[PDB]
Amino acid sequence: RGWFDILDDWLKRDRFVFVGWSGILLFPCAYLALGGWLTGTTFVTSWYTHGLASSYLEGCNFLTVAVSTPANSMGHSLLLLWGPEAQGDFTRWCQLGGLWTFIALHGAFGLIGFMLRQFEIARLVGVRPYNAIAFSAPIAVFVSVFLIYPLGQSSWFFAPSFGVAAIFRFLLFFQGFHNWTLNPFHMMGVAGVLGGALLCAIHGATVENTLFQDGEGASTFRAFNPTQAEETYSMVTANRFWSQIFGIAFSNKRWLHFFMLFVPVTGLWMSAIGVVGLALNLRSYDFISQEIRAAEDPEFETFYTKNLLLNEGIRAWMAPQDQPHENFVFPEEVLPRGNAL
Amino acid sequence: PLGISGTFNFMIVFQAEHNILMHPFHQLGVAGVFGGALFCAMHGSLVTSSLIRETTETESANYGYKFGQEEETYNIVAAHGYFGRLIFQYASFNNSRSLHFFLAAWPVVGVWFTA
Amino acid sequence: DIDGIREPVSGSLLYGNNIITGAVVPSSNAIGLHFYPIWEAASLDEWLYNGGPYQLI
Amino acid sequence: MEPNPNRQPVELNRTSLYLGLLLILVLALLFSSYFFN
Amino acid sequence: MEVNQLGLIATALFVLVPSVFLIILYVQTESQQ
């Protein structure tokens, strides 16, 4: 009955916002990650790391503000406020990109705290920990894209910057430089996200359209009681419908809901793997057979060769401004261009 | 195109000619399919988390459900008791019909917008 | 000849594609939005060059 | 010496067979292009 | 096309080996019942 058990008692009180031991890690880090993003997007420039404006203060709108990555010259520096780059100067820290590492690292530890919170609450309530397990997927995505990816490249500069448009730029970068759409790990991710959305919509609609008449109102919501034991919709009629419409249907409710966990979690895990490869420029960029043929046979053309011309345009046309530390000077005469345009 | 790389060609050229990423209806389509995947995982994991013990550890828990049984196979009050504490009480459903209507509506509506 | 410039794009497996690069290629820009059923072509050879199967599908 | 008490039958139902064969066949369809390269 | 010759055996065992595994487990499940 010492201080530890007393503190345990207080952390685990039933209150409007549950705290728990996991709260000690989660709440500071989540709030700081969030606060850093709002502070930076409202007030902080990207002029000295990127040559970009990036705050409301500077004239940007919600779509174009960002907390941008640090300058390529910082390498993979932790960029601690008290570190050798900012030397404790808050203002310089902001101008050097310090808020980026601040948000990413506090965000990482916040993600851990949130998954620990899922474990903690599930243990206290007596349920199985599958929600925690499902959350491993957004963890894997975050760490692979925000941490592992720039760690294999030259610096944090090439991680995603925290902004709407800046992420849009991240997508396009990956098309032109990595040919990421051609990557079967991304493709598995796509199937998992689109397949999850499909499952979400088709399950919600099936339930809502196989309901039992359990009340007299035209608003069928009121005829459900959370403590009733009876299923609220007919698995049997739902199974018949889908068997006759689609050929196959679910027949096991447990399998159905597990499958709903499985599909998007697996898809996200697959895409994380591909990004790990791209950390090393280990891309699925080319088909060698296609290139050999096309090199020898100028009448051979496929949607695969057409897309590589687009990538080549993306790279030459965006590199000078997107990577200003490289001092790329491309005279007009070297820019790849089709006729007229 | 009716092809995998042709689909990509279509996407890229669409982005150059229409800047679709900066269009709010595409942004809602992303919110529709990302949120769809999210809520798919959430619903799947919350129901799977609250399956009622009906089997031994040597058997698939799926055999604890029999096609057509009248009783529910999980405890929605325990699921709600877990999720409402994960966030706060009123951000969690305790009505299964509202919950499944929400599952249906979010991705459908987001994909209407992106179409 | 998807873009109507007599620059034919190969889409099928026997003409050097794999599953990822293969496609049924869209009909010719020369056709625009004109209806191009089989019986409007002088031959199947013509219909195939100009992208008829896409419209049918 | 007694026989080992820990032994257990293993099962794969027909629906799991269909689901697994589909997984394998679609994966092969997806990856074959990259194996041939 | 000048494809990787070994892609054929790679694809063939990638299909064959796990499929055979499932079929083995399925058939011995039926003969219990």
Binding site: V236, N239, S243, G247, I248, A249, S251 | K66, F67, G68, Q69 | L13, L14, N18, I19 | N13, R14, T15, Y18, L21, L22, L25, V26, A28, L29, S32, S33, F36 | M1, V3, G7, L8, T11, A12, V15
Partner: peptide, 30 residues
Amino acid sequence: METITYVFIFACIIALFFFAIFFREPPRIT
């Protein structure tokens, strides 16, 4: 050889569809 392989896998999937629909394990009430 690659064309044959691609089409073979595709045709095995179609065949699987046929067994999965017409030779499924039948759902049986309770």
